[PDB]
């Protein structure tokens with residue numbers, strides 16, 4: 001019987017961007033950099049073997065994801081609008097979604113392999129991801145009615161790699177956008193600024 005195992009390895013690190021003194025007519029800008037490191041399984045869908053013992057062939061399809069909010073609320077209830085300025089080589093998909101950007105990079109497909117492998121790691125299991133992907137540059141638009149004062153806004157987002165192992169050549173699977181949208185947002189960028197006059 002044909003099988004497909006798909007596992008999402010999630011990266012999770014914290015960083016900050018200090019925007020300094022800002023006026024509502026200006027657009028602060030920050031860069032989201034892909035940070036190789038320890039990833040945690042946060043989702044899977046499997047109906048195949050859990051381990052490949054090196055004696056039989058399977059096929060690999062890997063797709064990196066970044067799911068980033070289009071709007072983030074301040075603690076006092078004002079929207080900050082996140083706008084993509086430079087997506088690099090990323091594929092920007094499902095553009096009609098009102099709440100989140102979906103950036104994908106499918107970099108391996110239809111690759112036959114016999115290497116021993118953990119084909120269906122469980123949520124909570126970890127592994128090192130050494131792959132590097134392109135930066136994404138964002139700009140922020142502040143609402144003109146934003147009250148003056150100090151702002152600290154946590155911008156949570158998801159980044160990670162979907163690994164799909166299959167028993168057959170030509171296998172394709174993309175995590176549904178409605179599932180990707182709700183994957184845990186384990187990365188955080190803390191955006192600090194002061195709205196002045």
Ligand SMILES: COc1ccc(O[C@@H]2O[C@H](CO)[C@H](O[C@H]3O[C@H](CO)[C@H](O)[C@H](O)[C@H]3O)[C@H](O)[C@H]2O)cc1
Nearest residue numbers: 061062063090091093104105106107108109172174
């Ligand atoms: C055998 O003929 C092929 C024609 C075109 C192909 O396209 C490649 O498919 C890959 C499948 O994993 C991968 O596409 C995935 O990722 C894209 C984002 O980078 C996008 O989301 C696609 O919808 C997704 O399927 C490569 O990027 C394509 O160039 C493969 C074989």
